[PDB]
Structures are given as structure tokens and as C-alpha cells.
Amino acid sequence: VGVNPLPAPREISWGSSGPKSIAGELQLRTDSDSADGIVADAWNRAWETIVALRWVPAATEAPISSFEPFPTP
Amino acid sequence: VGVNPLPAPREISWGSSGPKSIAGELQLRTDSDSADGIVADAWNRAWETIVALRWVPAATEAPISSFEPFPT
Amino acid sequence: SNSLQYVNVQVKDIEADLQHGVDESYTLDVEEDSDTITINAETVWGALHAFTTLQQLVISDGHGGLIIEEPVNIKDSPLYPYRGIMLDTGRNFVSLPKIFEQLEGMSLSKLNVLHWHIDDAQSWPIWVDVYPEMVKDAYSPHEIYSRNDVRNIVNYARARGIRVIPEIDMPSHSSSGWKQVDPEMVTCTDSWWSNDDWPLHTAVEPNPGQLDIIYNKTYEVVGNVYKELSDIFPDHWFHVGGDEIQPNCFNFSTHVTKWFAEDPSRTYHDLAQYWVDHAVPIFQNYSQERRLVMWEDIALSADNAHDVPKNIVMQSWNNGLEYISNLTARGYDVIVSSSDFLYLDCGHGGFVTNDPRYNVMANPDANTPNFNYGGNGGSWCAPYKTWQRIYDYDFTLNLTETQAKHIIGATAPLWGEQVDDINVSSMFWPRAAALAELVWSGNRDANGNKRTTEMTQRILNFREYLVANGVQAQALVPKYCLQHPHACDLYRNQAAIQ
Amino acid sequence: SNSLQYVNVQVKDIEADLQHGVDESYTLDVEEDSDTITINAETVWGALHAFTTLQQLVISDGHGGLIIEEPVNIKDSPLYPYRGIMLDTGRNFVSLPKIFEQLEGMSLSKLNVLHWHIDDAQSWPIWVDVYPEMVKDAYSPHEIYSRNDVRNIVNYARARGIRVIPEIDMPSHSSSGWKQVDPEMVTCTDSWWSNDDWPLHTAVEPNPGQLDIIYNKTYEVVGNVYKELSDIFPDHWFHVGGDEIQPNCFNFSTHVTKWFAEDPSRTYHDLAQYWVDHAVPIFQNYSQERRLVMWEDIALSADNAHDVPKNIVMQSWNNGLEYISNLTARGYDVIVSSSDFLYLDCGHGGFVTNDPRYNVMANPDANTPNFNYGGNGGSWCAPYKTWQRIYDYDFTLNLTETQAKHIIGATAPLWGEQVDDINVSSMFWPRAAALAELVWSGNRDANGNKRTTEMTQRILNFREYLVANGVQAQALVPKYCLQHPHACDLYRNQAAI
């Protein structure tokens, strides 16, 4: 998995069922937001960031490469 | 004076007859510019900065202050 | 596979206010066949965290669409409830867009405390209604935080689950502002700080000044300024400061030296107590839920106060684990900010001028690190703390359980001698992301091994994210190292660190 | 008193092109009862300096208008013709607007050389027509310097009397780009740089690789790159590198292994000399006016070549005065870049990852500065060089009158491991302005005494001037120190320095 969210969440477990497309626009659903709409407001900012950035992971985890060994004749 | 150009010029000497206002805009006058107008262009940049900044010295030289002595 | 459409959020109680120790935990789930990203949080504040995690999972599919790469199960919560950075606006002013920018990075890394060091000896940038005259000591009329400026900072922070915890540093680091109210409530402010002649020194840093701990009216003004500020800052915590009490400064006050004459049994420890036993009541007086923070010096410097209430949170910055052990043993709740690991300002030489220590045209000793060759270059807390230094700090090492549970978190201070808008962000970021993980989820892998090498690509990517999000974070390596993972490691052995 | 209306500029030689040594001097006179600001200069380049001086003199009268505070007579010129900073776009990409911003800073501080370290092992960001494939080792398609980009850079500089001196570092620091043209032309690029296992080390820092000095075709490809680049950079000076040849890397070249085998008396000195005898004539032959610059390593390192032509300017970065004295005494022209005084990148610790040297939970030796406690923190050149450290540098100290004549100026480099658009300007500035004064008018007052304490307010003010001109220079002090002159001095005695 390319993404590597910071901070490392306590417990995170990824599947192998393949990628999940976002169907156009992710819609928030809650009947339990603070009266002043903090969850709604935070969501709107996150979603607008997600859609404007279309983030492409810039660095990703890998095993180390096979560097060519120092020769000895 | 308040101004203090960097680098300090090799030789610089100020008078004491007071300020000289820039009347209107300093017009450049020269007969001796390159064919590519290097000087004319540099003056436009320099002059447009001067009028846009209307600079106010942010730090000026003065002798270190007189502090009250440690009481004996 | 199924396509995602909705985000479902259930907050257990929508009433919990943004205060120390509020339940910040959440769960986030994406299932194969489910068209819904499921988020559960104890509070609104945990849900806010889910969203900042969530945006770091949703990436481009390479064809103008978005994906989460796999289904996923996340359960997550902060190891410590106090995860912070400290902004110094006393030494140099920082504008609101740039304060907003730090709060943005804070949000994406889940830091929940902006410790704001508002004033210092050098300036007083905050408007006070009761004493309009204090801001006469701001750097200019444009470099002032209006009442409304503070409300917007607090709100902008609240929207991102960040508590703003103010600091007016008393009784030291006090000259500017104060002395426009009453010039006799400050002493030695016209002294020479005198580190060229060390015995007569009134300060650690130039622009000397401290509050006259004896003078009647000191505590009225302090109380009025404090009460006004307390009202505009909705956190229950408040930072009184109390660091670096210089004994020689009081010699310039008749009062304090007369007070020492009256009874020559009186020492400087007594003088500290006097402030404690007069100032703390005034501060505790404000509110029922009011908690205090102060720098450790008050209860652990050379000239410390005999008895500091175990009620006051102690922010530790000296001697690393040693001083953390001392305070935690004596029943103090502690904020870790040890200078040897977490001071972000270090490593930029000294800022003090007319300084001949730089004027050495040759290495005076090639075998030992010295001032201009291997040594500090005039930064007392040198070297510069790299993100690794920060991430490696095991701040509960060799402590007991009873001790360890007195640690409430950490704060990385950025002192502002050589910091204004121009570099505040590149000094904070991405290194504060290293702290952010250290106090969120720690620096250990599943087996307890130190996972700094795993943090490499995470923090490197996170830096580029921060930049994508407006936060001007410093580059940490040649970009070749991001694209070639571990190609810039010093050891191939991924177990090199322990 | 009499109002100013005109700026008269008389330039004696309008032909003099922007090239090394051209006369940069000028006079600037504002007389009590004259309506004219009078500027005289030997060339247009001297005239530009006059304008940047002049803009620092015209200030607000606080009532909506503008003044010069008093009459003034100035006569000015630089102590050294080579006044530079070096930008590293090999480790990390710096965009055109940030390159322009630096040139603006140079303009205002009268620096006149931008030494452009274009590539390094880690990336090749510059478009080359003759080998299109080199930019495959650019960090991204949007992180490439097109030929038109270079034209606009050269030109932006030209307009501010700034010379751009390109550097393509050879034969060390060579992997990216070259290896796209021909894999054989570079060696040990796939090796492990191996500072964890010191006896096998192939480089001093990650991303190893060096041009194969023996491989015949190396000189074909370098000749073709050099030529195409020489054509787009108009300065007669070109920097061909020569720093930090690593002997261990050539053990990956069969070609060099055979070369040592076929005559076992050969040393790396000979190998270095082989490069000098084959590369230099190609470089020197571009044009008659061509002068080369090289890092001192080629003529002074442990693996130095035997005979480096005294044609080639040596850039000195190690051992301070000792290497400057050594070099000048052998007859080389020297650009001072001594890393103990002028390296702008030191003091940000190390960048190499998986480093256990940070992992020390208590001071292991309080009696002395060590890695994490008062020592270098992973930065080999620590500490960070303050503006004072830079300004205080008397780089002609103990040089004879003849040695000192071989000093042509200085260059503060900013190596790019932890530098890109975000912090490039705050790492250069305002420290670069301290070097600027050092090589323009020196660090001494009229009586020959070091005036560091006088520089304080000038550089503090100039920093703000930089910020007002769009140059994102770093704060140096609390602003209190600006507003209370000398309040922040360590020594009250103003002759301490």
C-alpha cells in the first residue's frame, strides 16, 4: 500500500480485495454533529483538499534495493 | 543620517545642509547607454522600487546607550 | 470491487468540549463490499482526526479518479493528551496567516496544543483593554494581535481540534509592556545584561528585565492583565511561565534589596516563594477549572522556591531524563520539552552582536570540538535537532510506572530570536511531524524495536504533503532519496537503530 | 534647500561586456544647491551599482514625499572582481522565481557571480539537445531547466550586472544524466555508498558514481555536453568541478582495473592526471577567452593529479588559510570558499537516514562537546556560520603581497541536500550580504580596525530592505535589537572585535 499516513495509526490493517474507487463525490452522513457544525465544517475542508490535491504518494516504503557488490578478483 | 547602504561604499561623505526633496520623479538623462538599454532599464527598476517602497530606515546607527550602573 | 460513496460518522457525545484530556480516539473502516467509510468517535474531536487520517489515504488512481488502495481497519488514539509546539511572538512577531499555517500542519499531524508565548522582554504584541498603553512596546502598530485577532486564532484552532494555551511569562522575561503601565513593577530593565562581565549579569539574553516581586502594585496589574487574557482564552490551562529567575536583576530594585536588609536571613529561594504565594492565588482565583503550567525552574533551578504546589504542571526543558525523573518523583505532572532533543531553534549560532568569539581565523584545537570548529557556534543548545534526534527521544526511559503516568505529553518549542514569518514554517516543519508521531503512536514497532528507519519514508512523504497543503516545510534530503527508498540510509541494516 | 529632478549618468565605455574584471567603479554626487544627482562610471556595470546604492539612500520624508537626507559624495568600487554565491540544483530543484529572487538579492548587495551548480550525482535537471535522454534523471518533467529557462536566467542576471557561471561537476559527482547517455561512462552508480563499512566506501555521501576516466567514449560525451552548454552560457568562465574523487569507486570499472593492472606502478594521482590531460584540453579549447574554474581537490587533495595548469582557477573550501596560502604560493588564482567560514548549509545536522548516532539518551561526555551535545549533530562542517563569522573572515591574513594578488574573490556556497524553494532564500540571506560587503569594501573601517560592530545595524536594516524587495531573508535578531542599537551586543566595549 503506497499511503503512509502520519502519525502511524496505533492499529491499521489493510486488505487485498483491490482498490476502491470513489464514486464521484464522498457525501457526509451524520445525525450526531456538535450544534455548531464542527464535524460538517472539518469534513468540507478535508474533502475539498482531497479533490483539489488528487494526491500521488511522493515517497513510499520498499525493501532496500540490491546494490551491486564490491568486486574481489 | 539614517540610511546606511550595503556594502558600505569605499568612500562616502555626507553634508549637513539638510534634506533634498525629490521633486516629482527623478528623470534619467544619459547619452551613454549600451545599445540594449541596460542602464535605462536598470533605472526604471530602481526608480519604481524607490517610489513603491517610500523606504523608512528600519534600523539606524547610534552610540550604544547609557545603562544604569550596578548599585554599590 | 465496490465503489465508495458516503462517509458515516457517529460521535458518542456531541457535548464534550475541547479541553485537556478529552477523548480523541476514533475508528475508521473501509470494507470490500461496503459503499460507506465508517467512522466512530467518542467525541467530535476524534472524528476530526479520522478526517485527517482519511485524506492521507485517498489518492489519485492515475486516470483523473480517486481511490483508497485497499480496504482498511483503523483503531487509533493518542498516547498522550498534550501534544504541542510553542510559538514565540515576543522576540519576533508572526502574522495571522502564518499562525494559521502552523495550525494547518498541526491538524494534519494531530498536534492538539498551540503553546503561544505571547510576550517577552523584547516586545508586548497583545492588545489589553485595561492597559491600552502596553502595546506601545509592540514592534509597530501593524505588529499587534487585536482582541479579534485572538478570537480568530482560537476559532481557527478550535475548527481543527487544537487548544491554544497562552503564556505570559512571569516573573522573569518581563520588561516590555509591563513598564508602560508602571515603571516600578519592573527592575533592571535599564541595566546592562553584562555577560561580558559575568558576575554583574542581569539576564541570560539581552533586553534584561524582571517583575519586582515585592512592589505592592506588581500583583494588581499582573492580576488585571491576567484576568482580561484569561477571559479571551477558552482553554482551562494557562501558562504563567516562571523560568530563568536572575538574582542580580533585583539589586536594581530598592524594594527587594530593602526587603533583604529588613531580614538578612532571607535568601533568593525565599524571594521565589513570595511570588509563588502571591501570584498563584491570583491565578487560581480566575476559575474553578483553571489549571496552571509553569517552567520547571520555579521548583528546580539553583534558586528555586521551597514549595511549589504539586498542582501546577511543570514543563521540563533541561537535563533531559534526569530533571524529568526529579520532578515526576516529587508528584508533578510534566510536559516534556527537553532542549537536548526538542528545542527547534537550536543550531543557528548566537544572535548576540559585537561578539568576538567568531573572530578566530584558525582552529585553536583540532583534537577537541570548539566554538567555530565542531562546537556550538554560539547556540547554547546546539546542535540543530534533526527529525531523527526528535523521533529517537525515549522520554520515559528508566522511569517507574507511577513516574511515567505523570508525563502528560510533550511540547517542541521554537524560540523566536531568529524566527519570524519568513522561516517559522521551515523551522517547525517537518520536524514537529516527528514529535507528532512520537507522542501520538510512539517510536516503536510491534516488537518494541525503534522504528526510526520506517519513519523515513513516512515523514519524507508527509513533508511533501504539508507543502501541497500550504505549509512551507523544509526539505530533509535530496529528492533522490524519496524516489529511491533507503538509498540514503547510512546502514543497509534496518536494525541499526535500537 | 534645492530639489532633485534629474539623474545624470555618464558612462565612459558603453562597449564593455559583462565579463571578468570589467570596471565596476562609479561616483555618485548629490550637491547642496544642484537639482541633479550625478553618476559617473567607467562602464554600464558601474552605473547599475550606483543605482542600487542610490535606492538605499532615497527614503520617505514621512509626509508622502521622498528625500535624500543630506548632500553626499560617494566614490566606490569592489576590492575583488569575483563576488559570488553558489546554488546547488543537483540535489534538489530550485524554480526560476526563486532563482530570480536570489539574483535580486545579489543585485542589491552587489554580488556579481552566480555560480550555478547545475547537476550532481542525484539529478540532471538541465535540458541537453544532443542527448535528450539525460533529463530522464530529472526529479520530474516539471523540474527541468529548459534552454529558454537558462536564457531567461542569464538575461535576468545580465540586467542586474550578474555573471552566471555554470558548473557541471566532473569527474566525481556523476551518475544521474550521464548514465542515461551511456551506462559505461559512469562507474559504481549501482554500488552501496558504504560508509557503514568504511574500507569499501565508494562516496562521501549517498548517490555514488563517477565518470569512467579511462573509458575512451567518456570524453566524447562530456565534450558534446560541455560544448552545447558552453554555447548557451556567455560568460568566458566555466566551472568543470574536480572535487572529491573517490578511489574506491573505480574498482567497479573493468576499464580502470585493467589500466592499473597493465602498469602496477600507477597511483590515483596518475588516474587524476589522466583526466586532467584528456579533459582539460577539450575544456580549454572551447574558445580563446575561456577560463576554467575547478575545486582545489584536483591540485591539493590526497589523490591530487601531479600537474594542474596554472591557467585554472582553484576554488578553496578546506583547511581555511592553509590551503589558500598553499594554492596562492604555487601561483594559482584562488576563489575563497573556505567551509569553516562561508559554507551556508552547515549546521542543519545530517540528512542520511537510518542513523544511530542520534540515538543517545544522555550526554555521554559532559566534559567536551560531542555528537548530540554541543557537537556537530551530523553536519560535517558544523556549526552554522553566522553573519558575524562570515564578515570576520580575513582571508588574506598572513599572505604575502603576491599571494594576496592571486585571490580573485569569494563564493559562499549553499549545497542543496536540505534546500529547495522553501528555504533557499532564508539560507542565502542575509548572510550572503555579509560576504557581499566583505569582498566589495572589506570588513575594516578607515583606520584599519575591524568594524563588525558597525556592520550590525547596516546588515539588520538591509535584511528588512531585502524582505521589502521580495527577498525572503531570515530574521537575525529580535526586532528590539533593531530599534535599540547595540542593546544586543555581548561586549559593551565597542572595540572588542
Ligand SMILES: *[C@@H]1O[C@H](CO)[C@@H](O[C@@H]2O[C@H](CO)[C@@H](O[C@@H]3O[C@H](CO)[C@@H](O)[C@H](O)[C@@H]3O)[C@H](O)[C@H]2NC(C)=O)[C@H](O)[C@H]1NC(C)=O
Ligand atoms: C546584590 O544584593 C544581594 C542582597 O540584596 C547581595 O547578596 C548578599 O551578599 C552578602 C555578602 O555580599 C551575603 O551576606 C553574607 O552573610 C553570610 C552570613 O552567614 C556570610 O556568608 C557573610 O558574612 C556575608 O556577609 C548575603 O547572604 C547575600 N544575600 C542573598 C539574599 O543572597 C549581593 O552581594 C548583591 N550584589 C552586588 C551588590 O554586587
Ligand SMILES: *[C@@H]1O[C@H](CO)[C@@H](O[C@@H]2O[C@H](CO)[C@@H](O[C@@H]3O[C@H](CO)[C@@H](O)[C@H](O)[C@@H]3O)[C@H](O)[C@H]2NC(C)=O)[C@H](O)[C@H]1NC(C)=O
Ligand atoms: C581497488 O583497486 C586498487 C587498484 O587495483 C587496489 O589497490 C592496489 O592493489 C595493491 C593494494 O594491496 C597494491 O599493490 C601491491 O603492492 C604491494 C607493495 O606495496 C605488493 O606487496 C603487492 O604484491 C601488490 O603489488 C597497489 O598499490 C594498489 N593500487 C593502488 C592503490 O592504486 C585496491 O586494493 C582495491 N581496493 C579494494 C578495497 O579492493
Ligand SMILES: *[C@@H]1O[C@H](CO)[C@@H](O[C@@H]2O[C@H](CO)[C@@H](O)[C@H](O)[C@H]2NC(C)=O)[C@H](O)[C@H]1NC(C)=O
Ligand atoms: C601544499 O600542500 C601539499 C600537501 O599536499 C605539499 O605537497 C607535499 O610536499 C612535500 C614536499 O614536496 C612532499 O613530501 C609531499 O609528497 C607533497 N605532496 C605532493 C607532491 O602531492 C606542499 O608542500 C604544500 N605547499 C606549501 C606548504 O607551500
Ligand SMILES: *[C@@H]1O[C@H](CO)[C@@H](O)[C@H](O)[C@H]1NC(C)=O
Ligand atoms: C599568522 O602569523 C602569525 C605569526 O606569529 C601567527 O601569530 C598567527 O597565528 C598566524 N596565523 C593565523 C591564522 O593566525
Ligand SMILES: *[C@@H]1O[C@H](CO)[C@@H](O)[C@H](O)[C@H]1NC(C)=O
Ligand atoms: C538507564 O539505566 C541503566 C541501569 O538501570 C543504565 O545502565 C543506563 O545508563 C541508563 N540509561 C540512561 C539513558 O539513562
Ligand SMILES: CC1=N[C@@H]2[C@@H](O)[C@H](O)[C@@H](CO)O[C@@H]2S1
Ligand atoms: C525556557 C527557556 N527560557 C529561555 C528562552 O527565553 C530562550 O528563548 C531560549 C533560547 O533557546 O533559552 C531559554 S529556554
Ligand SMILES: CC1=N[C@@H]2[C@@H](O)[C@H](O)[C@@H](CO)O[C@@H]2S1
Ligand atoms: C566542494 C564540495 N563538495 C562536497 C559537496 O558536494 C557537498 O554537498 C558538501 C556538503 O557540505 O561538501 C563538499 S564541499
Ligand SMILES: *[C@H]1O[C@H](CO)[C@@H](O)[C@H](O)[C@@H]1O
Ligand atoms: C514505494 O512504492 C511505490 C509504488 O506505490 C514505488 O513507486 C516506489 O518506488 C516505492 O517502491
Ligand SMILES: *[C@H]1O[C@H](CO)[C@@H](O)[C@H](O)[C@@H]1O
Ligand atoms: C535498486 O538500486 C540498486 C542501486 O542502484 C540497483 O543496483 C538495483 O537494480 C535497483 O534498481
Ligand SMILES: *[C@H]1O[C@H](CO)[C@@H](O)[C@H](O)[C@@H]1O
Ligand atoms: C541484487 O541485484 C543486483 C543488481 O542487479 C546485483 O548486482 C546483485 O548481485 C544482487 O543479485
Ligand SMILES: *[C@H]1O[C@H](CO)[C@@H](O)[C@H](O)[C@@H]1O
Ligand atoms: C538611528 O537613527 C534614527 C533616526 O535617523 C533613530 O530614530 C533611531 O532610533 C536610531 O537611533
Ligand SMILES: *[C@H]1O[C@H](CO)[C@@H](O)[C@H](O)[C@@H]1O
Ligand atoms: C539607552 O538605553 C538605556 C537602557 O534602557 C537607557 O538607560 C538610556 O536612558 C537610553 O535610553
Ligand SMILES: *[C@H]1O[C@H](CO)[C@@H](O)[C@H](O)[C@@H]1O
Ligand atoms: C548614562 O546616561 C544615562 C542617561 O540616560 C544615565 O541614566 C546612566 O546612568 C548613565 O550615566
Ligand SMILES: [Cl-]
Ligand atoms: Cl468539559
Ligand SMILES: [Cl-]
Ligand atoms: Cl522568609
Ligand SMILES: [Cl-]
Ligand atoms: Cl564550544
